[PDB]
Enzyme design. Structure first.
Site, PDB file in Angstrom:
ATOM      1  N   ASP A 131      56.922  61.264  16.067  1.00  0.00           N
ATOM      2  CA  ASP A 131      56.923  60.185  15.027  1.00  0.00           C
ATOM      3  C   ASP A 131      55.689  60.409  14.114  1.00  0.00           C
ATOM      4  O   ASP A 131      55.073  59.480  13.715  1.00  0.00           O
ATOM      5  CB  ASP A 131      56.636  58.545  15.672  1.00  0.00           C
ATOM      6  CG  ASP A 131      57.135  57.443  14.820  1.00  0.00           C
ATOM      7  OD1 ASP A 131      58.041  57.653  13.948  1.00  0.00           O
ATOM      8  OD2 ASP A 131      56.816  56.302  15.155  1.00  0.00           O
ATOM      9  N   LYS A 133      53.734  60.590  10.594  1.00  0.00           N
ATOM     10  CA  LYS A 133      53.998  60.163   9.415  1.00  0.00           C
ATOM     11  C   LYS A 133      52.814  59.622   8.829  1.00  0.00           C
ATOM     12  O   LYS A 133      51.955  59.213   9.639  1.00  0.00           O
ATOM     13  CB  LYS A 133      55.131  58.807   9.387  1.00  0.00           C
ATOM     14  CG  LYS A 133      55.004  57.777  10.521  1.00  0.00           C
ATOM     15  CD  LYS A 133      55.796  56.819  10.376  1.00  0.00           C
ATOM     16  CE  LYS A 133      55.649  55.620  11.478  1.00  0.00           C
ATOM     17  NZ  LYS A 133      56.569  54.771  11.702  1.00  0.00           N
ATOM     18  N   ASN A 136      50.706  56.728  10.719  1.00  0.00           N
ATOM     19  CA  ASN A 136      50.185  57.176  12.414  1.00  0.00           C
ATOM     20  C   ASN A 136      49.083  58.327  12.026  1.00  0.00           C
ATOM     21  O   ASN A 136      48.499  58.913  13.127  1.00  0.00           O
ATOM     22  CB  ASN A 136      51.128  57.789  13.344  1.00  0.00           C
ATOM     23  CG  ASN A 136      52.096  56.667  13.809  1.00  0.00           C
ATOM     24  OD1 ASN A 136      51.914  55.567  13.611  1.00  0.00           O
ATOM     25  ND2 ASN A 136      53.342  57.076  14.019  1.00  0.00           N
ATOM     26  N   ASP A 149      48.948  57.222  17.892  1.00  0.00           N
ATOM     27  CA  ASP A 149      50.435  56.556  18.194  1.00  0.00           C
ATOM     28  C   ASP A 149      51.277  57.469  19.326  1.00  0.00           C
ATOM     29  O   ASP A 149      52.310  58.059  18.538  1.00  0.00           O
ATOM     30  CB  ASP A 149      51.046  56.046  17.291  1.00  0.00           C
ATOM     31  CG  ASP A 149      52.103  54.940  17.421  1.00  0.00           C
ATOM     32  OD1 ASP A 149      52.221  54.702  18.490  1.00  0.00           O
ATOM     33  OD2 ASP A 149      52.969  54.240  16.405  1.00  0.00           O
ATOM     34  N   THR A 170      60.831  57.293  12.889  1.00  0.00           N
ATOM     35  CA  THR A 170      61.055  56.793  11.443  1.00  0.00           C
ATOM     36  C   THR A 170      62.201  57.403  10.831  1.00  0.00           C
ATOM     37  O   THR A 170      62.108  58.629  10.426  1.00  0.00           O
ATOM     38  CB  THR A 170      59.859  56.553  10.774  1.00  0.00           C
ATOM     39  OG1 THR A 170      58.848  55.985  11.643  1.00  0.00           O
ATOM     40  CG2 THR A 170      59.832  55.682   9.742  1.00  0.00           C
TER      41      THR A 170
END
Ligand SMILES: *SCCNC(=O)c1c(C)oc2ccccc12
Ligand SMILES: [Cl-]
Length: 284
Positions: A131, A133, A136, A149, A170
């Site tokens: 994840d 991005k 995070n 995260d 995401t």
């Protein structure tokens, strides 16, 4: 001994998930600040996801690197589970992207290099984030990155490496292989990297549309475009990461690994061994 909620003063919310919160906590005894991740057991129990929460806990206990959040302690309540994590005072990378619009070349190079260095460490442990991005990627008091995260992180193996993937991160940062065959490898994180670099230079992520179905369609078609104002060597880098075939992304095992990635011309000036000791350029 062990810590209890009463040992802390709880302040502002640093993060909001559906099933969780991250709160700024001061340990009264020492006055040290922590970002405490608070999980409601009810939700974890009810969705039978205990193994997943322990997985997050364990993955995080394997991290000992300046560019990654650190797990300091864990304690338990009647209704809540608490993870004490390093506190990143300066918040989300995304905040900075939003404030100045896009990063200049000096800043793009610097932060991309920290991220690449972070990923090489992570992947060197067989861990994939899944994840990745700008929300995070946090910034600490010294404005170095802190990647956080780990709820979606997975330990990888060679059998694993290659069609069972349970989790789709995401939409804007998801690779085509996660979508179509439910595979998830180191290379899928490298795709996210390409989206993030593009976002730093251009101000917004490469694949954009009015809903997730439309975004997915662009991703699987590799339908995106560079603006005219895009550092040429970053564009070459981005073009070598955003490649449909996972085995042909700069940085993956099949392309001889991190060596060639770190040797890309966009990184000519970078001194890879001392990154965490360098003073970061001011974000303007
Ligand atoms: S704070 C000690 C670490 N504990 C856990 O991760 C944990 C235990 C023993 O039981 C749990 C139930 C639900 C979530 C996390 C849990
Ligand atoms: Cl060096």
């Amino acid at each position: 001994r062990k810590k209890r909620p009463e040992d802390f003063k709880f302040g502002k919310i640093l993060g909001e998930g559906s099933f969780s919160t991250v709160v700024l906590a001061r340990e009264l005894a020492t006055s040290r600040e922590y970002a405490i991740k608070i999980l409601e057991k009810r939700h974890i129990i009810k969705e039978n996801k205990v193994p997943y929460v322990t997985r997050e806990r364990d993955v995080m206990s394997r991290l000992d690197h300046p560019f990654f959040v650190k797990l300091y302690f864990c304690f338990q309540d009647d209704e809540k589970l608490y993870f004490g994590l390093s506190y990143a005072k300066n918040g989300e990378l995304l905040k900075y992207i939003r404030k100045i619009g896009s990063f200049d070349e000096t800043c793009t190079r610097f932060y991309t290099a920290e991220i690449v260095s972070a990923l090489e460490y992570l992947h060197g442990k067989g861990i994939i984030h899944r994840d990745l991005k700008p929300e995070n990627i946090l910034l600490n008091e010294d404005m170095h990155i802190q990647i956080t995260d780990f709820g979606t992180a997975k330990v990888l193996s060679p059998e694993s490496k290659q069609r069972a993937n349970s989790f789709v991160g995401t939409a804007q940062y998801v690779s085509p292989e996660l979508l179509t065959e439910k595979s998830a490898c180191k290379s899928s994180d490298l795709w996210a990297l390409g989206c993030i670099i593009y976002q730093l230079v251009a101000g917004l992520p490469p694949f954009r549309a009015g809903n997730e179905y439309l975004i997915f369609q662009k991703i699987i078609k590799l339908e995106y475009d560079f603006p005219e104002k895009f550092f040429p060597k970053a564009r070459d880098l981005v073009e070598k990461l955003l490649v449909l075939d996972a085995t042909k992304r700069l940085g993956c095992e099949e392309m001889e690994g991190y060596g060639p990635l770190k040797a890309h011309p966009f990184f000519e000036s970078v001194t890879w061994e001392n990154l965490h000791q360098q003073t970061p350029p001011k974000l303007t």
